[PDB]
Amino acid sequence: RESGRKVQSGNINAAKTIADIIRTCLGPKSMMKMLLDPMGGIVMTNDGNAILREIQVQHPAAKSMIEISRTQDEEVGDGTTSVIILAGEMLSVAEHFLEQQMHPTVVISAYRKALDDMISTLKKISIPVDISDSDMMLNIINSSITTKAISRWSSLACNIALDAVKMVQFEENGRKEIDIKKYARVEKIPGGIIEDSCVLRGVMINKDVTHPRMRRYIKNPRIVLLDSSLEYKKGESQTDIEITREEDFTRILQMEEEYIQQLCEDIIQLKPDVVITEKGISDLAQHYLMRANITAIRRVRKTDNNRIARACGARIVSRPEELREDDVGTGAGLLEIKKIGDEYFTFITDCKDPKACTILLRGASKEILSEVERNLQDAMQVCRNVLLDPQLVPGGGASEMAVAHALTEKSKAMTGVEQWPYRAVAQALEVIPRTLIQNCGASTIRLLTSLRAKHTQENCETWGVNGETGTLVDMKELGIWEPLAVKLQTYKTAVETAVLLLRIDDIVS
């Protein structure tokens, strides 16, 4: 039985002490968190998702901090370190001045109006980026690969990642909102080397098909996706027992191949040389196709065959008795199975429903593959937010101090009770401008002062704090940039958490 301010302050003390070490983990210059296991194990990370899952939390508000980090992780995966930083000082600064005065609902609606004023200010500060220029996309990826500070061959993986996500931009909800990255697929290769690879059309497959079971190479013939009914007929048109007897062998087998050859004649109408079958696939059905001069494929998961259907832009047929070129294998299509290393890798290019290209990476080992991949994993996060919003916001304290001022004149204009949470959120925005001064090592009281002074003149349009040089730098000149969409949802999550724990005054069993 828990109630009152003590739940509220316990919500404060838990959410604050989480964000303390993790804001030192912020910045490309950061401070690693140390985690001593009781077995003596050591964790030295900055990424809060590995942090929050490893640490032991006893307050369910601290468990809810993981849940809003699970919220940001499942939508993006990045900024999960940053969503918990902003949510601390929202409830740290405003609450105890006002919950000694005890108005929960007013601070909720103050948290409402802190959100939309930030939204318009995002459109004030963000100039649009080119979604038709690689170099406009390049420097923002270069801002992301230097976070882990890996540019061995991640720099050439910048162009591989942008030529995947910009290509796979196709996603509808009635107004074509595209925030997809699952339509892209990386190639996980132990052989070859990264640099003489490039993006290929369609959606490339590495997950199950690693063998030339399709053909060796295909120029003209189409791909066939089969979720249709390929279960053979045991009786005349009946489902009797299967072959387990010589008496069951002679009668039934004549009608077993009879169901299959009708399907095979329907498929040869579009002239393939490759047919993959997933649902209803039988052992006899995929080897009369061997007699029908088509090498047939099974044992593939469904998410492969969503990619393979997007590798050709065709609809997977549920009609068994008629197949067309306008049903499976849209257009001519291309299928290329070549040797990279020792294994023969299936590429499916020439995607009709065009603009579909995926990632081809190949390390000299799997470890050499995996290190470049994580940088390209962060890179495909960024371009997906570029597809989500084609405007770029300056990094550092340029975005934060600009919004931190606009709440103040909003607080002077509205000048109700909500004016006091605005200035509190205005200071809650500055903690990432605060923590970069420890992420560099400079005097924090002077740099926050001069960043206010640059808002007086320059309005902090592109002059924010750098935790790399400790000075208030042009984000145009230094190339520290990020999309508006990743900035908004990071702030949107921190608004959601601050409203959440403000409702929490009782924790009972």
Partner: protein
């Protein structure tokens, strides 16, 4: 035990009341609820959360039975009955501490409970049609959290309330009653939200057909299909004959022509518009156009089962008879006024006008976002709960918090001329009435003691009526609580909700004062 268990009754129930005071109304708050070792739920509407929580005391146990007794019967006043009874426990205890029999207070508690429901009897209004329930526009307006839905706050609320309130719609499989069930209103975006309009009939998102099939049919007979198409499977059973190997391909294409006979038999019983939950090929659309039929494929089952219950007789959305594509025998047909194809959201969709067997009504909402679809869900749940209180309680009570101050005025005179100890029992029952404006202003983050003092200050005599708000009691707000007229921003209440909760509160309070033992082996 004795007074200490009667103390333990009060101290347990006060803590339970503190939970649901922080969860009352839309300005109530969500509370963390440990139920397992790693599962904590965070909700309000505190009668629901007591079902989530586990009981600790028998004092805590008996009241979870009471709120669930309210909650099984109706969804309104469920968290409120908990707060009222705990106020009775502190009021009667001081009197028992003073000099008073526990028997004597609960008499005047129930006698005032008889007196208060007789105030509810004289505080009735049956005219709730143009007045609406909670100020027709404000029936959704406090529930439309004004983000991008308060800009049409009088526009939407004029539309969504009048479409459900007393006008026609069919209930489950054609029951005679005005709309108490969920309706065929759809949420979809496009071009605006000011273009959200009322339609006469049914909203259906569907995949229309185009090879020369009829686009608009008046006086249509509807076949609501549960069973799919795009082929019926057969490899033997027609044409066993063999002359050529070309004839073997002639065998297994006879699955086509057997469907041709069964479509005309579906057309023969009654059919003009074919609505299929599954898909229909254009080769399978050819079965319907040579018979003469309007086949619309890939019909959503959610809207279609609202139509299949509306269309009348034995329908294929309820049939289990299947032959791959079954054939009608006798009297399988659904009914409609007309089927007119419309341009809505700039999408050509089949807008089914009213079915015979209780003609209907629905709304096609338009938005600009998928977020517009989300907010109008709760702007659909609110009006349906408004209208359901109207149709089964035509006689309602004006004011739900305005009545609480005036009932305290109604009982002090009822206390005064009563006589003896019962007078003090009527008054402390009226002290329990004051908590309802008190818990709201704290939930609305306002002053409770100021707001309830405003309420009693508006008075001529002890009767809540929609005459005036400056010299009579009327209405409230769920976010302000200031007494307001019940067409602009005030409040109504069904008569059935209060008479149960006032009865249930004294029902709990009588048994608690019986408790004077803690005997145990």
């Amino acid at each position: 035990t004795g007074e200490t268990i009667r103390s333990q009754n009060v101290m347990a129930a006060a803590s339970i009341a503190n939970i649901v005071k922080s969860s009352l109304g839309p300005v109530g708050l969500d509370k963390m609820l440990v139920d397992d070792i790693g599962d904590v739920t965070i909700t309000n509407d505190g009668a629901t959360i007591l079902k989530l929580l586990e009981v600790e005391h028998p004092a805590a146990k008996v009241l979870c039975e009471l709120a669930d007794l309210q909650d099984k019967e109706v969804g309104d006043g469920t968290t409120s009955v908990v707060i009222i009874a705990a106020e009775l426990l502190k009021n009667a205890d001081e009197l028992v501490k003073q000099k008073i029999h526990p028997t004597s207070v609960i008499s005047g508690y129930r006698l005032a409970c008889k007196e208060a429901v007789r105030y509810i009897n004289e505080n009735l209004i049956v005219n709730t049609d143009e007045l609406g329930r909670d100020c027709l526009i404000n029936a959704a307006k406090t529930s439309m959290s004004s983000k991008i839905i308060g800009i049409n706050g009088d526009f939407f609320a004029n539309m969504v309330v009048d479409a459900v309130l007393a006008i026609k719609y069919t209930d489950i499989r054609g029951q005679p009653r005005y709309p108490v069930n969920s309706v065929n209103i759809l949420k979809a975006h496009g071009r605006s939200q000011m273009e959200s309009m009322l339609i006469s009939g049914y909203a259906l998102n569907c995949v229309v057909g185009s090879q020369g099939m009829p686009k608009r049919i008046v006086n249509a007979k509807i076949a609501c299909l549960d069973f799919s198409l795009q082929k019926t499977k057969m490899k033997l059973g027609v044409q066993v004959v063999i002359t050529d190997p070309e004839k073997l391909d002639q065998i297994r294409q006879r699955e086509s022509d057997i469907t041709k006979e069964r479509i005309q038999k579906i057309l023969a019983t009654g059919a003009n518009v074919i609505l299929t939950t599954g898909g229909i090929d254009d080769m399978c659309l050819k079965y319907f156009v040579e018979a003469g039929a309007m086949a619309v494929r890939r019909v959503l089952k959610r809207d279609l089962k609202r139509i299949a219950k509306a269309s009348g007789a034995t329908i294929l959305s309820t049939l289990a008879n299947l032959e791959g594509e079954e054939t009608f025998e006798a009297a399988m047909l659904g009914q409609a006024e007309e089927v007119v194809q419309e341009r809505i959201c700039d999408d050509e969709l089949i807008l089914i006008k009213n079915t015979k067997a209780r003609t209907s009504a629905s709304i096609i909402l338009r938005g600009a976002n998928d977020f517009m679809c989300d907010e109008m869900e709760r702007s659909l749940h609110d009006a349906l709960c408004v209208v359901k209180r109207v149709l089964e309680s035509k006689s309602v009570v004006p004011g739900g918090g305005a009545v609480e101050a005036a009932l305290s005025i109604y009982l002090e005179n009822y206390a005064t001329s009563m006589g003896s100890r019962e007078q003090l029992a009527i008054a402390e029952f009226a002290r329990s009435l004051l908590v309802i404006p008190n818990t709201l202003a704290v939930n609305a983050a306002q002053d409770s003691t100021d707001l309830v003092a405003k309420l009693r200050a508006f008075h001529n005599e002890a009767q809540v009526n929609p005459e005036r708000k400056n010299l009579k009691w009327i209405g409230l707000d769920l976010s302000n609580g200031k007494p307001r007229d019940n067409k602009q921003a005030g409040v109504f209440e069904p008569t059935i909700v209060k008479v149960k909760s006032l009865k249930f509160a004294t029902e709990a309070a009588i048994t608690i004062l019986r408790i004077d033992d803690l005997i145990k082996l």
